[PDB]
UniProtKB/Swiss-Prot annotation:
(1,4-alpha-D-glucosyl)n binds at residues 65, 101. This is 1,4-alpha-glucan-branching enzyme. Belongs to the glycosyl hydrolase 13 family. GlgB subfamily. Pfam families: Alpha-amylase, Alpha-amylase_C, CBM_48. It comes from the Eukaryota. InterPro entries: A-amylase/branching_C, Branching_enzy, Glyco_hydro_13_cat_dom, Glyco_hydro_13_N, Glyco_hydro_b, Glycoside_hydrolase_SF, Ig-like_fold, Ig_E-set. CDD domains: AmyAc_bac_euk_BE, E_set_GBE_euk_N. The gene is GBE1. The active site is at residues 315, 352. Glycogen-branching enzyme participates in the glycogen biosynthetic process along with glycogenin and glycogen synthase. Generates alpha-1,6-glucosidic branches from alpha-1,4-linked glucose chains, to increase solubility of the glycogen polymer. Binds its carbohydrate substrate close to the active site, but also via regions close to the N-terminus; this may result in increased affinity and therefore increased catalytic efficiency. It comes from Homo sapiens. Monomer. GO terms for biological process: generation of precursor metabolites and energy; glycogen biosynthetic process; glycogen metabolic process; negative regulation of neuron apoptotic process. Changing residue 461 to Q: In GSD4 and APBN.
Length: 637
């Protein structure tokens, strides 16, 4: 790790992009010439990079699948271009909705049929083994009607998957998400959507991590225009949309994927074993290769320009960095971040990194990776440890406080999307187990295990939200403690969609207790919008009492008190504060609307006195019941 090196290297490649291409703007507009394009003159212009092809051709429905009638002309640097002249009758050469294929001929004599790396749209017809390359030329394009929202003060991310966003056991649509799921997200107080599994993946059960077509918005959920309408509608509501970018590896599919494009093992990827990820059975990009930079950077630009995304989450950053560290992978990520922020400084980039790479989330100008945030991955693990291995009486308050406050800006989350999956437990499941199925009805008794589960689900989320980071993340359903698990159709379940859905109706059912966990989430995010603790400096922790099981801190002027004690309810408990005067309850997890016992009267005025307590100048006395969290705001006398 030499920061002077990381910059000098980046600075050089960027300088070359300027001398060789016309700067990173021009360089990242590769999607404008590569692929298949209909010209204003009625002709068709095509361009590809196939360095190890003897010949390249265009075939499809349009030419009665004659493989060699349209040969591309070879250019320098292993690139090929084709211009089919316009029709005499002045009609479309390649009709919209029709099938296409690139024909690659090898030195040996193999005749290979490929989908262009640059393909905009791909569809799997009924029960076909492979995806077909569908030419996209609609009568009307989607015109974006709304402007990008003002950059949020603090991010409150709602991690979403479009397919599973309905109560039905089927792939839900972009249209369904736009009409039914966007208003729910807005209502909860979330100001950002992390859109998962958008980049085309042939294997649905890969959760969007096995990419086949990099420039293609998954056909599965609908047309490219319906995704544009989705993003535009989110903007109409003041919600920013970020995309999950998988540039770490590629699916090894060759018929309908990026693998073996020009017939060799070294096109967009590394030759031999270096180019194969053994654990994932995937291909690995040759980040040193100029054309891989054009491809990957024109992809970043594509999602910014075509679909108007407000930023990205770069997945598999750890795997990219360690093949010792891959300098090329890292210089690619620096150029990607440089591009995103040069085009729009308000744009956000997040890194999915477990390693904790020094300066990954710091400015490039200081030898950093250029990322705005990293995910605070230690937080979900600490909650798992405590619920799996420790009795409530044995939870260390100092260890909770340490894990949450360790730090570079990070995104805090109580549980990941991976924890929602089959053969893993959600926080709601770790807390209530089999009782989740029995006593989540208002009509059944409020058992001590349902009572404990509800109280702790709220508290774990609130301490993660208030103390854990500079941003917050919640995966679809976990805001109301969604039951069961998530599982995608695959071999191992005989293609079942029974768990490939989200039961959102559970919160609308007044005869169920999910409404309580949902109400808490809505009010937690709305209170954050009002006071901005996520944007505030790190909290001042006055108390992390091992005996009493009390965590007390101040962030953005608010006073946060947590009683994790399984049985003791403290009266006249002294909490230190930096502010004198009157204090009022702004949030109480024991309120009835959240599934509490209503033990506290909110109309009570708490008066700060001049009594040094826990390194705080003033202190106030409070009633904090067992498994209750409180937020107190200082008010004008
Ligand atoms: O007249 C006085 C003047 O004379 C000299 O300079 C001459 C040059 O000698 C002459 O060639 C020309 O150079 C221009 C050139 O015409 C311009 O186009 C431009 O070149 C840029 C280019 O536009 C950029 O794109 C960039 O090129 C990349 C390329 O895009 C990228 O794909 C990659 O290419 C590699 C490829 O991907 C690989 O697959 C492989 O290619 C293989 C094929 O796979 C294989 O199938 C087969 O076809 O062979 C190929 C080659 O082995 O390798 C490729 C790389 O080798 O990388 C390149 C990066 O190089 O950059 C170029 C360069 O900037 O600009 C140049 C000028 O810089 O005109 C000038 C004069 O006008 C003399 O040198 C000078 O001092 C005198 O003043």
């Amino acid at each position: 790790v030499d920061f002077q090196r990381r910059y000098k290297q980046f600075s050089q490649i960027l300088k070359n992009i300027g001398e060789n291409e016309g700067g990173i703007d021009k360089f990242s507009r590769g999607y404008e010439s590569f692929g298949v394009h209909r010209c204003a003159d009625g002709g068709l212009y095509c361009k590809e990079w196939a360095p190890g092809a003897e010949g390249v051709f265009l075939t499809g429905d349009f030419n009665g699948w004659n493989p060699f009638s349209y040969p591309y002309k070879k250019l320098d640097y292993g690139k090929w271009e084709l211009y089919i002249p316009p029709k005499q009758n002045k009609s479309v050469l390649v009709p919209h909705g029709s099938k296409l294929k690139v024909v690659i001929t090898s030195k040996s004599g193999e005749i290979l049929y490929r989908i262009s790396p640059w393909a905009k749209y791909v569809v799997r017809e009924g029960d076909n083994v492979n995806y077909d390359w569908i030419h996209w030329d609609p009568e009307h394009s989607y015109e974006f009607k709304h402007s990008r929202p003002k950059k949020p003060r603090s991010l409150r991310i709602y991690e979403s998957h479009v397919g599973i966003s309905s109560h039905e056991g089927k792939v839900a649509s972009y249209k369904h998400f736009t009409c039914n799921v966007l208003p729910r997200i807005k209502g909860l107080g979330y100001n950002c959507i992390q859109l998962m599994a958008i980049m085309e993946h042939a294997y649905y059960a890969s959760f969007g991590y096995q990419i086949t077509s990099f420039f293609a918005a998954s056909s599965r959920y609908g047309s490219p225009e319906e995704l544009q309408e989705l993003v535009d509608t989110a903007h109409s509501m003041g919600i920013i949309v970020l995309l999950d970018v998988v540039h770490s590896h590629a699916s090894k599919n060759s018929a309908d994927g990026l693998n073996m494009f020009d017939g060799t093992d070294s096109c967009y990827f590394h030759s031999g074993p270096r180019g194969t990820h053994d654990l994932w059975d995937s291909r690995l990009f040759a980040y040193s290769s100029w054309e891989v930079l054009r491809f990957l950077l024109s992809n970043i630009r594509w999602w910014l320009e075509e679909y108007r995304f407000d930023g990205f989450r770069f997945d598999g950053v750890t795997s990219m960095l360690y093949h010792q560290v891959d300098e090329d992978a890292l210089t690619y990520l620096m150029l990607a971040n440089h591009l995103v922020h040069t085009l729009c400084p308000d744009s956000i980039t997040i890194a999915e990194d477990v390693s904790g790479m020094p300066a990954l989330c710091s400015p490039i100008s200081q030898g950093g990776g250029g990322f705005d945030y990293r995910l605070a991955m230690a937080i979900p693990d600490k909650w798992i440890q405590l619920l799996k291995e420790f009795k409530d009486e044995d939870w260390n308050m100092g260890d909770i406080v340490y894990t949450l406050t360790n730090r570079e800006k990070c995104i805090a989350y109580a549980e990941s999307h991976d924890q929602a999956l089959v053969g893993d437990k959600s926080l709601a499941f770790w807390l209530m187990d089999a009782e989740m199925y029995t006593n989540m009805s208002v009509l059944t008794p409020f058992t001590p295990v349902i009572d404990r589960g509800i109280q702790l689900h709220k508290m774990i989320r609130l301490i993660t939200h208030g103390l854990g980071g500079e941003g917050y993340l919640n995966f679809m359903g976990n805001e109301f403690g969604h039951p069961e698990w998530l599982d995608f159709p695959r071999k191992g379940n005989n293609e079942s969609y029974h768990y490939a859905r989200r039961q959102f109706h559970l919160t609308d059912d007044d005869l169920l207790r999910y409404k309580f966990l949902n109400n808490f989430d809505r009010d937690m995010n709305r209170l954050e919008e009002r006071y901005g603790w996520l944007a505030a400096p790190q909290a001042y922790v006055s108390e992390k009492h091992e005996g009493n099981k009390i965590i007390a801190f101040e962030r953005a002027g608010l006073l946060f008190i947590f009683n994790f004690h399984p049985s003791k309810s403290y009266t006249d408990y002294r909490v230190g504060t930096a502010l004198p005067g009157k204090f009022k309850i702004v949030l109480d997890s024991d309120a009835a609307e959240y599934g509490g016992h209503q033990r506290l009267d909110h109309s009570t005025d708490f008066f700060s006195e001049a009594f040094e307590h826990n390194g705080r100048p003033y202190s106030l006395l409070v009633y904090i019941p067992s498994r209750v969290a409180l937020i107190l705001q200082n008010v004008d006398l």
